[PDB]
Symmetry: D2
Subunit: 218 residues, 4 copies
């Protein structure tokens, strides 16, 4: 007894490259209406693009508004990262943690009003990155606590070792000792999880962290 498909207004932050693109293209193939944010380089053919520096609250506000006018209010929000000294630490925190907050907060009133919302946070694949990842999880669990009564869930996807364009650039196999699956994952493997969390099957999952790591984070 599978729930009939509903085509959602979807926003994928950083949806023009790497894992973000895989997610964006999967969700579009699913039958959703998919928009993406980028840093200026352009949204991939097919999809609706807005330029957004997630460090900037006004840019986020204007982005959501252009999306709203284009395809209706954001129902499904996929938040992708984002990006030792004080400057390096605050930069990653601003992009990856506070950037997640900014987009989540801009999304929340519309989702609460409409009694539908899926916030899906993609954790980064080092003190700054560890801190911002754990912070997003803490934040997501907190959004889940407040908003779930309104049918607005917040869940996290925690990717393990995934083959990106930039992953392939490293001297890499020492990582496989720590992975029970004994292999790297694909961008498509992560996008499959986002697709499920975006579907009508995930309505009773809220405040969860799903690891997509071949067993690594056990």
């Amino acid at each position: 007894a599978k729930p009939p498909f509903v085509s959602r207004s979807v926003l994928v932050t950083g949806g023009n490259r790497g894992i973000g693109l895989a997610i964006a293209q999967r969700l579009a193939a699913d039958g959703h209406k998919v928009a993406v944010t980028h840093r200026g380089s352009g949204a991939p053919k097919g999809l609706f693009g807005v330029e957004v520096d997630v460090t900037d609250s006004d840019a986020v506000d204007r982005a959501f508004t252009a999306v709203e006018e284009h395809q209706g209010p954001v129902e499904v929000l996929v938040s992708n990262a984002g990006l030792m000294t004080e400057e390096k630490f605050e930069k990653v925190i601003n992009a990856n943690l506070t950037g997640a907050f900014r987009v989540a907060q801009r999304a929340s009133r519309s989702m609460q009003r409409n009694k539908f919302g899926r916030m899906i946070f993609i954790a980064s694949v080092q003190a700054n990155y560890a801190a911002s990842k754990a912070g997003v999880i803490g934040m997501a669990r907190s959004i889940a606590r407040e908003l779930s009564k309104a049918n607005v869930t917040a869940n996290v996807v925690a990717p393990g070792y995934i083959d990106t364009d930039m992953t392939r650039a490293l001297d890499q196999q020492g990582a496989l000792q720590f992975i029970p699956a004994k292999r790297v994952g694909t961008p498509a493997e992560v996008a499959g999880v986002v697709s499920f969390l975006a579907s009508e099957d995930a309505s009773y999952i809220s405040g969860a962290v799903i690891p997509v790591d071949g067993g690594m984070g056990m």
Copy 2:
């Protein structure tokens, strides 16, 4: 970029009632070849059933054998829990913890040999239940560590309050179908890189 569907040989333990039945029915509608074990009340209409007491290793072996003949070697195992004194403690541990081991072990040979397997353990919705459920998660994580190299994963679904409340973020109970939805995903081609995970299906309860 969806991966093409593959019809799997599925065994659902306790697939005749409640959460078990909804799982068996969803997987059949998904397009899998679905068999169920049951305690004696009968399989669901149309689906191949076998009577199994999961405290009985020989009854486990017979069931798997009869299923292998019917529809081919078991590729995906959905293990549903079968249900303070020393007697009651050991009973629940035998059914819910050792029972999961018995089915997981009987399934594992053919999964490793054939280089595909998905083990999906559904935790139970007292000291004995707490220990059985936690014991299953530890056992699943251990199987995940051993067999993931052979494309054989082990994951756990942790249901909350399912109808078969203020202290729940969602402020409602879950349906048996919301559980079966997650099992359908775990049994699908989209879950290949998930292994050793506990997916809570509880509307935010166990956070």
Copy 3:
């Protein structure tokens, strides 16, 4: 602002060797009244010992009784683990999981009645061990939920590699004394508001 010392009646299961012995010796030096169970090789010099097979509920009851007479009703229980086929699986589950339940249950009446108790379960340093250890944590959390109102806590110590390595942040093994140090703290007046916790003693390993 340290709370004054109270000499507790302590039972340490398997307190005759390895981690068990170091725990029993530390607690005795701390100033507690320390008894140990053992498998038959004998108690440590000076300490009151009783032979117990933790798979035997009646042997558990007898031991507690003999200890109550010797030094007074057990106030702090340190439960040390006693140590793939269906036979080997059930064996480890009986000793490490059900064995912990048997001692925890025999201890609990007097702790609730007397409004003080500290249960300290030492996890083991395979599918059976993974399940037993995870099962003990779930059981400890359950006891913690039930009995904490009566000033009866249950906590778990999870030791890593203990000498009784690159994949360890500390880059060394732990001593049996580093484990006993944490048990000493858990048995002390400083631990009253810790209940249902798993304290890892592993140099960062299980992070």
Copy 4:
């Protein structure tokens, strides 16, 4: 076989009030050399005080230096918090997360050189607070990973409901349903845990989160 006591150079951030003071006074009663940071109001009689806004990297630097000259390099660091809109969110993140980083980073070189260090982070007792608490844990686990080989551990203390001066000001008993112990904890109960983590008995605990919550966070 208890390890002989060693009197450590200790720094307690926010050690002049509430749980911070309890910790500071306990550690001093233990026999450590205890310094505290404050916001201007003064360190409690007995103890060495430095004024430090943990938002300010230069103030942190000068504080550690005054402590070093007074009683020797910081061996034991107790980091106390610290303190929905963007401003409120970034303020709590700056004080509670980046503030933790600042003091941890200023402490680290001396601890690494001397092959001794105990970093103990006291988590706050809401999206901003949840995020910063989870972030500190993520950070601490990351410090533990890098520094433990040099005998520098990082552990977290996660207080449940504790009776402060400010706790007593709230309409409070609805909290007790969620606490198996069925009572509030005392500042002294938390300080007892810090005392253990600061002692010679905690050397093989690193990257741990100890909850002091009567069972609450189970």
